[PDB]
């Protein structure tokens, strides 16, 4: 047909393609092949002049689908996406004088979650800046597809820069971006335990940028392995110091192996016993009376704490709960911890 | 082969079990001309760290050895001075020994020997030896940092030289072991004196170096306020790491008046979301305290008035996102009215929206 050949001929191409647009209201692979063989972020992202580039030739298709009979013309762009995958995220770019991104769902249903993931991976590989400036709206318009698994989170953190991580934490702290949910955050961090160094630091900073209380994720302490997981251990230590210790947190801290090169437990216990002395004493007393966390593990962690607390002026082993618990407990492993029991005896 | 002299040193050369053979030389270099030691140390230098399992029964395997005996013979030292010339010439020939001594000092008594060795040119000696150690063996530098910072606080807390040295090569696991050492009372790398200047200097380092510096600072117990003036120096595009860490740590603070002064005293850029983020956080958890501080700042107790007003208008335009009665607090409305009364007519229509919150009902 000769109008489509006129569009081929010109290459102010908007009305020229509106010719085809008007004609596709009653064998499209050749049209989409022509369109594909025919064919992102402005350097200064200024509002309403970033849409200066959003016009142009191909994006006009998007426009004609943003206006019932709203269904008999997305087949063309479905064939475009089946030919050229990149347009899949270009649409997202266009959608962010459009209405709302509720069009993209309708576009996805011709291949939502796997479409979003592939388009976002292509965007990540090609243009990182576009992925940054697209992440908030993506996570907002599609929460039940993006908050469930660290796929998209890993995608972002694998390529993100420190300045891009700063703009992302800002977006989180401003009410514009939400990347975790109290449901999935634990699963997602246990998954994150396998990522690169800076990827894991980015994940943890982004989690702190939300307002999810530490306890929701303190079970992760089970999974934190001395040799294997430095970043999550460091962030969890530096955040746990700032918390009033619950009994479950001190159980989780004591339920980690005693390795002579592992300084997490004794560090956090020293901090707690110096600022929350009687509360920590109460919790470890309640733990000592039979609440693996074998008794000798608690005793060894406490003996490490005792041998360390001589560094400072700390009457923590004078607390009445701890001496009460020590004498109650003492009544095989005995010769191992004589000193400890001796603080509650002599 | 090597311009030579005395036969005890020649037996040590012949073997190359060398410990007593070398203490022979040690004892011989007591009643000696101080002219012929450069060739002895040249022989010793042309002659020539951490055990894989660092057990205080296999690190003392390495503290033995032939050269360390010199150190040993000086750790029983009046006549406590007349034998540092030999190792001074060793250091002038082979610099590495400078930190080996430190290693030796970490079944020795106390490290007050190292100063006596340094006086052969303490601070620049420490810095050169620690830089050489950083260059050669990072693992030794890590396992030596605590004692270095402890035995010489006034030499290592003075400038970020040593901190930069460590963070430039450190690993994430070694950064975790260092944060642990800090949190255990064994290592202190900042002090309320220098910490502010030291971080302002750190603002020029690489990404991961700055991340390490900030993590290590949080591992200490220096309150944020002591370093909150650094917000003046933090520039939006250029300093992401310090801004992000400062944001996530300011999140955990009940806002002081100086902290809100420092947050309000940074420029308003439409891509800079630091101030409005932290203000949103504060006004959502401690709304009326933040309002009290902004009232005391607005009645003037640099921060120009329009800067505060623009930051507050950004906060207002953002707070429509959520349910936040922060602009219903009485301190903030009282302050708004006080400001509006003595306000340039320009800023009246400039912030009409803002002032109307304290005017209309």
Per-residue HEC secondary structure of A225-287 comes to: CCCCCHHHHHHHHHHHCCCCCCHHHHHHHHCCCCCCCCCHHHHHHHHHHHHCHHHHHHHHHHH
Does residue A308 lie within any of the structural domains? yes
What does each C-alpha distance from A209 to A42, A112, A214, A314 come to in angstroms? 28, 28, 12, 34
Say yes or no for a CB contact (<8 Å) between A234 and B243: no
Tokens of A62: 């998007």
d(CA B45, CA B165): 27
**Last residue of one domain, picked from the residues A180, A212, A244:** A212
d(CA A69, CA A49): 31
Would you give the end-to-end CA distance of chain A in angstroms? 103
Does residue A233 sit in the same domain as residue A320? yes
Does residue A43 lie within any of the structural domains? no
Residue A164: CB atoms within 10 Å: 20
Q: Which residues contact A305 (CB under 8 A, 6 or more apart)?
A: A266, A269, A270, A273, A316
Tokens of A104: 């993209």
Distance in Å, alpha carbon of A210 to nearest chain B alpha carbon: 10
Q: How far is CA B341 from the centre of its chain?
A: 48
Tokens of A65: 């689908």
**Chain A residues within an 8 Å CB radius of B171:** 230
Give the H/E segment covering residue A165.
helix A162-173
d(CA B7, CA B153): 45
Does residue A167 sit in the same domain as residue A262? no
Long-range contact list for A141-147, CB < 8 A, 24+ apart?
A141/A100, A141/A101, A141/A102, A141/A104, A142/A101, A142/A112, A142/A116, A143/A178, A143/A181, A145/A112, A145/A113, A145/A116, A146/A116, A146/A179, A147/A178, A147/A179, A147/A180, A147/A181, A147/A183, A147/A184
- Cβ atoms of B310 and B332 within 8 Å: the answer is no
Closest Cα to residue A240, out of A207, A265, A260, A206?
A265
**Last residue of one domain, picked from the residues B220, B252, B270:** B220
d(CA B5, CA B12): 13
3-state secondary structure string, A176-188?
CCCCCCCCCHHHH
d(CA B4, CA B125): 31
**Chain B residues within an 8 Å CB radius of A165:** 240, 244
What does each C-alpha distance from B70 to B57, B64, B73 come to in angstroms? 21, 10, 5
Tokens of B290: 């933040």
What does each C-alpha distance from B43 to B4, B73, B232, B241 come to in angstroms? 8, 20, 57, 50
d(CA A214, CA A94): 38
Number of domains, chain A: 3
> Residues preceding discontinuities in chain B at C–N > 2.5 Å?
16, 48, 77, 106, 121, 301
Is B299 in a helix, a strand, or coil? coil
**Last residue of one domain, picked from the residues B185, B220, B255:** B220
**Chain A residues within an 8 Å CB radius of B318:** 174-175
By CB atoms closer than 10 A (0-12, 13-18, 19+), residue B240 is buried
Would you give the end-to-end CA distance of chain B in angstroms? 101
Tokens of B184: 């255990």
- Cβ atoms of A204 and A168 within 8 Å: the answer is no
d(CA B354, CA A200): 41
d(CA A85, CA B132): 54
Long-range contact list for B102-107, CB < 8 A, 24+ apart?
B102/B129, B102/B133, B102/B144, B102/B147, B102/B148, B103/B49, B103/B62, B103/B63, B103/B140, B103/B144, B104/B63, B104/B68, B104/B71, B105/B71, B105/B147, B106/B144, B106/B147, B107/B60, B107/B63
Residue B117: CB atoms within 10 Å: 22
- Cβ atoms of B120 and B156 within 8 Å: the answer is no
Closest Cα to residue A123, out of A174, A158, A168?
A158
d(CA A168, CA A160): 10
Distance in Å, alpha carbon of A304 to nearest chain B alpha carbon: 11
Domain that holds residue A256: 220-346
d(CA B199, CA B210): 9
Does residue B356 sit in the same domain as residue B228? yes
Cα angle at A285 between A279 and A286, to 5 degrees?
A: 95
Q: Which residues contact A123 (CB under 8 A, 6 or more apart)?
A: A89, A92, A130, A131, A134
Residue A332: CB atoms within 10 Å: 5
d(CA B145, CA B131): 12
Long-range contact list for A194-198, CB < 8 A, 24+ apart?
A195/A154, A195/A157, A195/A158, A196/A158, A197/A230, A197/A231, A197/B172, A198/A157, A198/B208
Does residue A130 sit in the same domain as residue A67? no
Q: Which residues contact A11 (CB under 8 A, 6 or more apart)?
A: A38, A57
> Residues preceding discontinuities in chain A at C–N > 2.5 Å?
11, 26, 39, 67, 96, 111, 291, 331
Say yes or no for a CB contact (<8 Å) between A162 and B274: no
Which DSSP string corresponds to B60-92?
A: HHHHSSSTHHHHHHHTT---SSTTHHHHHHHHH
Q: How many Cα atoms occupy the beta-carbon half-sphere of A223 within 13 Å?
A: 16
Q: Which residues contact B234 (CB under 8 A, 6 or more apart)?
A: B203, B242, B243, B246, B266
Does residue B159 sit in the same domain as residue B26? no
Say yes or no for a CB contact (<8 Å) between B215 and A205: no
- Cβ atoms of A135 and A177 within 8 Å: the answer is yes
d(CA A188, CA A288): 33
Does residue A131 sit in the same domain as residue A88? no
d(CA A108, CA A130): 20
Long-range contact list for B18-26, CB < 8 A, 24+ apart?
B18/B66, B19/B64, B19/B65, B19/B66, B19/B69, B22/B66, B22/B67, B22/B69, B23/B69, B23/B73, B26/B69, B26/B70, B26/B73, B26/B83
Does residue A45 lie within any of the structural domains? no
By CB atoms closer than 10 A (0-12, 13-18, 19+), residue B346 is exposed
Distance in Å, alpha carbon of B277 to nearest chain A alpha carbon: 5
Length of chain A: 346
Residue B145: CB atoms within 10 Å: 26
What does each C-alpha distance from B241 to A162, A166, B258 come to in angstroms? 6, 7, 22
Which DSSP string corresponds to A41-84?
A: --SS--TTTSHHHHSSSTHHHHHHH----SSTTHHHHHHHHHH-
Tokens of B173: 């696991």
Does residue A7 sit in the same domain as residue A74? yes
Tokens of A255: 């339920």
Closest Cα to residue A28, out of A16, A20, A17?
A20
3-state secondary structure string, B3-46?
CCCCHHHHHHHHHCCCHHHHHHHHHHCCCCCCCCHHHHHHHHHH
Closest Cα to residue A239, out of B251, B244, B284?
B251
Tokens of B271: 């891509």
Tokens of B36: 């012929």
**Chain A residues within an 8 Å CB radius of B251:** 173, 208
Q: How many Cα atoms occupy the beta-carbon half-sphere of A14 within 13 Å?
A: 9
d(CA B97, CA B33): 24
Give the H/E segment covering residue B93.
helix B84-93
- Cβ atoms of B143 and B179 within 8 Å: the answer is no
Determination technique for this entry = X-ray
Q: What is the torsional sign of CA A332, A335, A339, A344?
A: positive
Kindly list the residues of chain A whose beta carbon comes within 8 Å of any beta carbon in chain B.
Answer: 161-163, 165-167, 169-171, 173-176, 197-198, 201, 205, 208-209, 227, 230-231, 233-234, 237-238, 241-242, 261, 263-264, 266-268, 270-271, 308, 311-312
Which DSSP string corresponds to A183-240?
A: TTHHHHHHHHTTS-HHHHHHHHHHHHHTT--GGGGGGGGGT--TTT-HHHHHHHHHHH
Length of chain B: 361
Output the CA torsion B225→A233→A196→A133 (10° steps).
-40
**Chain B residues within an 8 Å CB radius of A261:** 177
**Chain A residues within an 8 Å CB radius of B248:** 169, 205, 208-209
Tokens of B295: 């009232």
Does residue A345 sit in the same domain as residue A224? yes
d(CA A77, CA A67): 15
Does residue A80 sit in the same domain as residue A145? no
Cα angle at B319 between A46 and B243, to 5 degrees?
A: 65
Does residue A285 sit in the same domain as residue A183? no
d(CA B87, CA B94): 9
Q: What is the torsional sign of CA B270, B275, B281, B285?
A: negative
Does residue A201 sit in the same domain as residue A240? no
Name the DSSP class of B224.
G
Tokens of B61: 């395997």
Give the H/E segment covering residue B135.
helix B123-136
d(CA B27, CA A135): 74
Does residue A148 lie within any of the structural domains? yes
Q: How many Cα atoms occupy the beta-carbon half-sphere of B112 within 13 Å?
A: 6
Backbone phi, psi, residue B230, to 5°: -60, -20
Place of tokens 């009457």: A315
Which of A174, A234, A308 is the closest to B273 by Cβ? A174
Residue B92: CB atoms within 10 Å: 12
Distance in Å, alpha carbon of B345 to nearest chain A alpha carbon: 29
Does residue B250 sit in the same domain as residue B312? yes
Closest Cα to residue B25, out of B107, B103, B62, B13?
B13
Please, what's the b/e burial string for B256-285 (b: 16 or more CB within 10 A of its CB; e: otherwise)? eeebbbbbbbbeeeeebbbbbbbbbbbbbe
Closest Cα to residue B95, out of B123, B59, B135, B65?
B135
Model resolution, angstroms: 3.1
d(CA A268, CA A228): 19
**Chain A residues within an 8 Å CB radius of B271:** 167
Tokens of A112: 């939502």
- Cβ atoms of B341 and B305 within 8 Å: the answer is no
């Amino acid at each position: 047909e000769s109008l489509r050949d006129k569009v081929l001929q010109l290459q102010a191409q908007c009305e020229v393609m509106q010719e085809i647009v008007d004609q596709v209201l009653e064998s499209e692979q050749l049209s989409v092949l022509a369109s594909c063989l025919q064919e992102v972020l402005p350097e200064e992202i200024t509002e309403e002049s970033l849409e200066e580039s959003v016009g142009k030739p191909l994006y006009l298709i998007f426009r004609n689908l943003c206006q019932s009979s709203f269904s008999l013309l997305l087949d063309l762009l479905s064939e475009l996406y089946q030919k050229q995958p990149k347009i899949g995220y270009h649409l997202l770019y266009y959608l962010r004088a459009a209405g709302k991104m509720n069009l993209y769902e309708s576009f996805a249903q011709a291949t939502l979650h796997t479409c979003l993931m592939m388009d976002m991976k292509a965007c990540q590989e090609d243009d990182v800046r576009l992925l940054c400036h697209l992440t908030p709206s993506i996570y907002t318009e599609f929460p039940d597809e993006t908050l469930r698994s660290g796929e998209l989170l890993n995608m972002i953190v694998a390529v993100i820069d420190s300045a891009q991580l700063q703009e992302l934490v800002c977006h989180v702290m401003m009410g514009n971006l939400v990347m975790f949910r109290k449901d999935s955050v634990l699963n997602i961090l246990i998954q994150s335990l396998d990522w690169e160094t800076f990827e894991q630091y980015c994940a943890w900073q982004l989690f702190l940028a939300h307002n999810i209380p530490l306890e929701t994720i303190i079970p992760i302490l089970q999974h934190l392995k001395y040799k294997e997981h430095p970043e999550a251990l460091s962030c969890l230590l530096l955040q746990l110091r700032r918390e009033k210790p619950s009994e479950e947190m001190v159980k989780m801290v004591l339920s980690r192996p005693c390795h002579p090169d592992d300084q997490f437990t004794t560090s956090i216990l020293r901090h707690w016993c110096m600022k929350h002395d009687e509360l920590l004493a109460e919790h470890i007393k309640s733990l000592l009376i039979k609440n693996q966390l074998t008794l000798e593990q608690i005793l060894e962690h406490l003996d490490n704490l005792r041998l360390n607390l001589t560094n400072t002026k700390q009457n923590f082993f004078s607390q009445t709960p701890i001496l009460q618990a020590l004498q109650h407990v003492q009544a095989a492993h005995k010769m191992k911890f004589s000193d400890l029991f001796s603080l509650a005896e002599e």
